[PDB]
Amino acid sequence: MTEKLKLTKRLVEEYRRFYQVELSKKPSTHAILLPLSKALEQILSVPDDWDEEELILQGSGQLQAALDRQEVYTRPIIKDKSVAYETRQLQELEAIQIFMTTCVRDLFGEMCKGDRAILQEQRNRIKSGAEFAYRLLALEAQQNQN
């Protein structure tokens, strides 16, 4: 089971470490999938004229740029600990970078065959995967005591 059971965690569980919209707000599908949306866009929008690690580091550059528009209630790595900005921002940036190691070297590189067309006809479907996975984890974490 492991090789894609761990992906059915990591596809949301590796972004839950830096991004969590509270599901009780009943927020949009777009608002929950925001990390993955901007990873799959980085992965569809360029040819292999630069490395998989260059795709990881530039894509990390997108999410750390985009999430400065979201309100700080979305970012558990800022909410849930009390430490200096330039160090929590480094913890944020490297948590974003490891999430894109899943997105580039396992989700794109293995599961989407490593070919952008086979991702593109699936992007709504692997989005609906993350949509269910985020709720499957978070609503258990909130409500399992009932």
């Binding site: 949009s28 949306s37 569809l44 952008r116 067309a117 593109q120 709504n124």
Partner: protein
């Protein structure tokens, strides 16, 4: 120009085709961000980039088949209604409902673009398309845009909760080019002026017509032949070779390169070619068709004759 070509066509629509094809070879350039979708994503396919050079695998957008025939077709029906040859009111004898039991079996739309009902019968289209492919790769020919849907209050909240009406949509960029060949089987001169009229006079394509999808169809050639020429894809692949894999070049340059590729390819097809209208002769033909469609009496005459020809076809060979 057109005065000479009247001799190439049938004098009335034949029972069965007799190899009098006319092929329209055109580049369809995007304006205003089109959407070509079926299952909620832009249609794309993995493809070979070129023919001889440029052997690498490449994802390219596809304008899937009906999405280029039916905008043309409906713009034709609109002109038939405007000239008063057909009607939309259910009390009229010359009504033509688009797709249903109430559809006509004798107007130019029905006999050229085809129809099926069941009871009355059916008629195979005389205009032949195929799905058309982006000359460029998909990665460099698309962008996805967010849309939101607030209240008139200028907000996403009405009771202090959010309404959550936000999503994104995948759009084709402007100046993305789809090479296409449209083909017509055993038409009359008037049937030719009708379908060519549609190609030139139709501007909006794909989803969200009301907001997007304007396209600049540059006709590159017209070729009269005993049979079928190359696919849309073979023209796209031959053109990516001649474009050297470096598609970031002007629209006029891309049009003249397509005329040179079309003529290089036509010489490799096992079909006779009665005429090949390209270059200055096509700009002369296009201008003589633009004169027809701007002149009210002449357009009414030509397209009126077509109605008679299609009524004759219907009463002699068609669904009676």
């Amino acid at each position: 120009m057109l005065d000479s070509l009247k001799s190439q066509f049938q004098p009335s629509f034949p029972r069965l085709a007799s190899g009098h094809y006319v092929h329209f070879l055109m580049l369809r350039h995007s304006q205003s961000f089109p959407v070509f979708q079926t299952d909620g994503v832009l249609n794309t396919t993995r493809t070979q980039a070129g023919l001889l050079e440029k052997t690498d695998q490449l994802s390219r957008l596809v304008m899937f088949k009906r999405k280029q025939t039916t905008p043309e077709r409906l713009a034709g029906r609109e002109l038939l209604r405007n000239l008063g040859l057909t009607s939309a009111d259910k009390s009229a004898k010359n009504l033509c409902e688009y797709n249903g039991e109430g559809s006509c079996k004798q107007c130019p739309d029905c006999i050229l673009y085809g129809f099926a009902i069941g009871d009355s019968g059916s008629e195979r289209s005389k205009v032949y398309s195929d799905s058309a492919f982006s000359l460029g790769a998909y990665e460099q020919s698309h962008r996805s845009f967010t849309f939101n849907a607030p209240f008139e209050g200028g907000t996403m909240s009405e009771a202090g909760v959010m309404r959550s009406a936000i999503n994104e949509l995948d759009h084709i960029l402007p100046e993305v080019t789809f090479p296409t060949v449209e083909s017509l089987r055993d038409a009359t001169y008037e049937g030719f002026i009708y379908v060519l009229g549609n190609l030139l006079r139709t501007k909006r394509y794909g989803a969200q017509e009301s907001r997007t999808g304007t396209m600049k169809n540059h006709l590159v050639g017209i070729v009269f032949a005993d049979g079928e020429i190359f696919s849309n894809l073979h023209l796209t692949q031959a053109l990516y070779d001649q474009m050297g894999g470096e598609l970031n070049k002007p629209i006029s340059e891309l049009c003249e390169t397509a005329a040179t590729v079309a003529q290089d390819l036509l010489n490799k097809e096992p079909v006779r070619k009665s005429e090949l209208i390209f270059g200055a002769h096509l700009d002369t033909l296009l201008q003589e068709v633009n004169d027809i469609y701007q002149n009210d009496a002449e357009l009414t005459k030509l397209l009126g004759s077509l109605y008679q020809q299609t009524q004759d076809y219907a009463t002699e060979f068609g669904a009676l």
